[PDB]
Design a protein around this ligand. Structure first.
Ligand code: NA
Length: 95
């Protein structure tokens, strides 16, 4: 039920992307104070800069201009009360 509004575990949510276009990783959370980390598999953290990558607790991560670097398995992580919670997204190019 928390911290992610919609959690995808073993079966990731598939998201279609296009290079040069906005990509939203929709791991919105149930309250705005939850710190969420974005990792690209295997172990590649994407830090939001408020520019090319924005965090919005009500929307998820917004990537204004998606690149080849965002193709693949993306995971949002949040830690609550000593527990690590994960939700998974698999991107691939529209065509
Ligand atoms: Na989600």
């Amino acid at each position: 039920g928390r911290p992610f509004v919609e959690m995808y575990s073993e079966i990731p949510e598939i998201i279609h992307m296009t290079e040069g276009r906005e990509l939203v990783i929709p791991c919105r959370v149930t309250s705005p104070n939850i710190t969420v980390t974005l990792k690209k598999f295997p172990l590649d953290t994407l830090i939001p800069d408020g520019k090319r990558i924005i965090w919005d607790s009500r929307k998820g991560f917004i990537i204004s201009n998606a690149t080849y670097k965002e193709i693949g398995l993306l995971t949002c992580e949040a830690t609550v009360n000593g527990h690590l919670y994960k939700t998974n997204y698999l991107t691939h190019r529209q065509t």
